[PDB]
Write a protein that binds this DNA or RNA. Structure first.
Ligand SMILES: Nc1ncnc2c1ncn2[C@@H]1O[C@H](CSCC[C@H](N)C(=O)O)[C@@H](O)[C@H]1O
Ligand SMILES: [Zn+2]
Ligand SMILES: [Zn+2]
Ligand SMILES: [Zn+2]
Ligand SMILES: [Zn+2]
Length: 904
DNA sequence: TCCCGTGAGCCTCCGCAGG
DNA sequence: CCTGCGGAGGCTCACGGGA
């Protein structure tokens, strides 16, 4: 029951209601009857589509300033008075200066190791705490203590209020209190997952406290309880918590292994380890840009305009911020200082490293990275010593010649892999040949995936590249997209119909649909994924009975229902960023409480498509879920550096800042992707040009290009066609400076004959702006008599859009609109339909006088050129606009492969 | 003195019978 | 096809806290 709507950008919608045709004249404000209820024949919006498009550039991501949670379960727990406290039985085991026991009595009551006690806080605002006593002992001086493994109330979790009052979660919080702090012996049951879980589908939207999942306070993750087993030297005082905290602390501290020699109070080792990684002499190493500085002199970096000619120019009041990639080096030596008398020394391990040169590092500077491979380096004779605890990872860098295979193949077969072919010298600024002493010493079953809301097959394409899934069933209502999907996934039958329809069938028990296709049944689906269009409630205000009801019938819950009658191993819900805040973050909390209700393992976070191989600002929300018998996937780690501005990854819900398992929040392995690298090899084409297929007048001129270009023997450049802008729009565009950052605000206020012979007049500021004043030439700056609106003050067919300055004063000067993309910059959140005056409309080709084309938009996304599309020009744009950056999906799918291989 | 923000109500048509 | 109708979004305008 959803109807589309007209867009408010394109010219067709701007043009005034003439009053010469049937409909337009029949209006009520024209004396007519109005019993027709229509719009002017000259207002028929072409870019017309459903307003399902949410994430309308909001400032909810800003104001990040906020401390970390981890309440510590508060402090100062009220103390209770006890009459009698006697032990029971013989001390289970009394080693050093303690004597543990089996049970205990507190005023006649019996507490046994394993029982869940309760404690009262110090503030009557925070509910009573619970914990599972892991031990009981008698210290030689402290007295009678006990170790309480804390229990996190459901009303203290992301679920907050939507959490089942009786549900508790395991938390790595625990202290050693004094028995007298106990209040009661509350019983807590463990609602473990049914043996035959994956079959409990159909269901509708407790009697005592129970726990079933472990909760991570800072990452908002819901994983299965640790299967950690005790030993014989602690079986009486075992604490899952401490064990985890102990192992985690052991993984942090960097240690060393084998040694080689002792010299100058500094032993030379051969191997060392950190956070689980094995660093050997000869391996690669990542390092912060503050590590060292190449001896190459670190590359060191108009009059007023005719006030009257360029009026709105004053409005310009308010990847340059992009950090530097990681530093790469070869580990030549590994050692540690020593205080005369002793030989070894931890906490101070050093590393001898051979500095590597990225093209954008040599004298040739940044422009060298235009044709270079994002993983190409240069060997040099420089070296530098860095504090081991500073490395940021492990990498692989080999000689490009000793590679026992094709270089293009070597890089694609590994994660962090680099390669060099020549040596560089800073002093002589020359490119010598790498010394000889520099050369090296010389699958699982695909998941049956079901992708509803498949679209043109964006997210699906990513997994098929990561070799993790196998889309066999795709649900797409929009015929265009559906058809396209089939063109890319011939091995899967596409159900081109409504989602609510199919689930209403299989649930009612059925084998096929009208067309006659095999429907997915219980167990057939291993993985579920898709992007549910959030339409019926793109709000941000508190939920209400009216809208809430409109939610319980949305396409988000329907996706959840599919996740219910299929209980797949892995469930993924991608969507716009603001999904984590819609309706006061409620929609998010509900879809989580919904997954947790199904006893699912789930988490959530935000990713910046750019950081994964895309010259585009596209933050999106991600909801990951895993079956009770699997491992909850981690979030992809940024592969490319990106402007800190479009990386407000953090998310806050009810005064609680939540983040992700991502470490690299600044630097990264590979350099950022630019518009140049994205679309520089594309031929010059004119506005409107609708040539479906054409050739590449020029070989690849960028890494990101040699990739997407494909390896097909057919040089077919498909869909390099762009929209046909109005003759007037073509004028506005041609009058936009190629100067990086130019937009409507820099348009000439003059008259010009269009390709229609018809001439567009100038703009008249017949009013004053009490917030802008006059021009440098005392000229007026007000467009409308409201600066009430005087409909007669409206002006049409003008170079500088009448509307812009009109509303300009309250929408940040529409900075960007009708702007051109700068080569060094990056596309703004790609959309489903490019329009100069569209919210996110800085879409004017860097140099050419037109709007980005479909193929260029394909490039903005991760879509290769081999990928096919379907439908008319506008139909295509929307497919690409909705789709998910394959490079994001891939990198997001690999974090899942590490879970399938986890098995257990 | 400005800002949202939260509706209630007028305004502007899109699908759709239904002819 | 209209030809006109039911009825959904959104766009505008009258307040009510909150700095
Ligand atoms: N419930 C539903 N059933 C079938 N198709 C739907 C649908 N809801 C929306 N669609 C269609 O699917 C399109 C969005 S598809 C979004 C796909 C996502 N970006 C991805 O590839 O990961 C819309 O144009 C809409 O017409
Ligand atoms: Zn329009
Ligand atoms: Zn008309
Ligand atoms: Zn403990
Ligand atoms: Zn006005």
């Amino acid at each position: 029951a959803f109807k589309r709507r007209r867009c408010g950008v394109c010219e067709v919608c701007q043009q005034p209601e003439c009053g010469k045709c049937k409909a337009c004249k029949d209006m009520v404000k024209f004396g007519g009857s109005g019993r027709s209820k229509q719009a002017c024949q000259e207002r028929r919006c072409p870019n017309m589509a459903m307003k399902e498009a949410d994430d309308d550039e909001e400032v909810d991501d800003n104001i990040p300033e906020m401390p970390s949670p981890k309440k510590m379960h508060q402090g100062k727990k009220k103390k209770q008075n006890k009459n009698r406290i006697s032990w029971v039985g013989e001390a289970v085991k009394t080693d050093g200066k303690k004597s543990y026991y089996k049970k205990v009595c507190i005023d006649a009551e019996t507490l046994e190791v394993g029982d869940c006690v309760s404690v009262i806080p110090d503030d009557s605002s925070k509910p009573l705490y619970l914990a599972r006593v892991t031990a009981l002992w008698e210290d030689s001086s402290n007295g009678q203590m006990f170790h309480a493994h804390w229990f996190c109330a459901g009303t203290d979790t992301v679920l907050g209020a939507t959490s089942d009052p009786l549900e508790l979660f395991l938390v790595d919080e625990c202290e050693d209190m004094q028995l007298s702090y106990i209040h009661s012996k509350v019983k807590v049951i463990y609602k473990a997952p049914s043996e035959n879980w994956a079959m409990e589908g159909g269901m509708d939207p407790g009697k005592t406290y129970f726990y079933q999942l472990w909760y991570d306070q800072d990452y908002a993750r819901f994983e299965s309880p640790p299967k950690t087993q005790p030993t014989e030297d602690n079986k009486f005082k075992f604490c899952v918590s401490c064990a985890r905290l102990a192992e985690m602390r052991q993984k942090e501290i960097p240690r060393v292994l084998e040694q080689l020699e002792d010299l100058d109070s500094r032993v030379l080792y051969y191997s060392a380890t950190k956070n689980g990684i094995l660093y050997r002499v000869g391996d690669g190493v990542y390092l912060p840009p503050e590590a060292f500085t190449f001896n190459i002199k670190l590359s060191s970096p108009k009059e007023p305009v005719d006030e009257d000619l360029y009026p709105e120019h004053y409005r310009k009041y308010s990847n340059l911020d992009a950090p530097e990639p990681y530093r790469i080096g070869r580990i030549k030596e590994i050692f540690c200082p020593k205080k005369s008398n002793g030989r070894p020394n931890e906490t101070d391990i050093k590393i001898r490293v051979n500095k590597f040169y990225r093209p954008e590092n040599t004298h040739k500077s940044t422009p060298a990275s235009y044709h270079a491979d994002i993983n190409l380096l240069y060997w040099s004779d420089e070296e530098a010593v860095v504090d081991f605890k500073a490395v940021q990872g492990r990498c692989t860098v080999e000689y490009g010649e000793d590679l026992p295979e094709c270089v293009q193949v070597y890089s694609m077969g590994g994660p962090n892999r680099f390669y060099f072919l020549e040596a560089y010298n800073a002093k002589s600024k020359s490119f010598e040949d790498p010394p000889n002493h520099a050369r090296s010493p010389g699958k699982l079953p695909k998941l049956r995936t079901l992708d509803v809301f498949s679209g043109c097959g964006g997210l699906s394409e990513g997994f098929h590249q990561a070799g993790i899934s196998d889309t066999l069933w795709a649900i797409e209502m929009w015929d265009p997209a559906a058809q396209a999907f089939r063109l890319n996934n011939p091995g899967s039958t596409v159900f081109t119909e409504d989602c609510n329809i199919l689930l209403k069938l299989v649930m009612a028990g059925e084998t096929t649909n009208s067309r006659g296709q095999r429907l997915p049944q219980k167990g057939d689906v291993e993985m579920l994924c898709g992007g549910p269009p959030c339409q019926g409630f793109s709000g941000m205000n508190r939920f209400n009975s009216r809208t809430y009801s409109k939610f319980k019938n949305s396409l988000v819950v329907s996706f959840l229902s599919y996740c219910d009658y299929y209980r797949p191993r892995f469930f993924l819900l991608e969507n716009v960023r603001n999904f984590v805040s819609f309706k006061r973050s409620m929609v998010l909390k509900l879809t989580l409480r919904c997954l947790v209700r199904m006893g699912y393992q789930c988490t959530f976070g935000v990713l910046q498509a750019g950081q994964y191989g895309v010259a585009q600002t596209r933050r999106r929300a991600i909801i990951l879920a895993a079956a009770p018998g699997e491992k909850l996937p981690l979030f992809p780690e940024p592969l490319h550096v990106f402007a800190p501005r479009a990386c407000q990854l953090s998310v806050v819900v009810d005064d609680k800042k939540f983040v992700s398992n991502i470490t690299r929040l600044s630097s990264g392995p590979f350099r950022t992707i630019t518009v140049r690298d994205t679309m520089s090899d594309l031929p010059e084409v004119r506005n409107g040009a609708s040539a479906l297929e054409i050739s590449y007048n020029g070989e690849p001129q960028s890494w990101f290009q040699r990739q997407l270009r494909g390896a097909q023997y057919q040089p077919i450049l498909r869909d390099h066609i762009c929209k046909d802008m109005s003759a007037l729009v073509a004028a506005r565009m041609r009058h936009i400076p190629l100067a990086p950052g130019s937009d409507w605000r820099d348009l000439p206020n003059i008259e010009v004959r269009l390709s229609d012979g018809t001439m567009a007049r100038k703009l008249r500021y017949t009013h004053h702006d009490r917030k802008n004043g006059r021009s440098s030439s005392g000229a007026l700056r007000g467009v409308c008599s409201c600066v009430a609106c005087d409909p007669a003050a409206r002006q049409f067919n003008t170079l500088i859009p009448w509307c812009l300055p009109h509303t300009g004063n309250r929408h940040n000067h529409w900075a960007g609109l009708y702007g051109r993309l700068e080569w060094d910059g990056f596309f703004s959140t790609t959309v489903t339909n490019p329009e100069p005056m569209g919210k996110q409309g800085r879409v004017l080709h860097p140099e050419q006088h037109r709007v980005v084309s479909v193929r260029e938009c394909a490039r903005s996304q991760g879509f290769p050129d081999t990928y096919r599309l379907f439908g008319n020009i506008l139909d295509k744009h929307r497919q690409v606009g909705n789709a998910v950056p394959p490079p994001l999906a891939k990198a997001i799918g690999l974090e899942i492969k590490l879970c399938m291989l986890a098995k257990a």
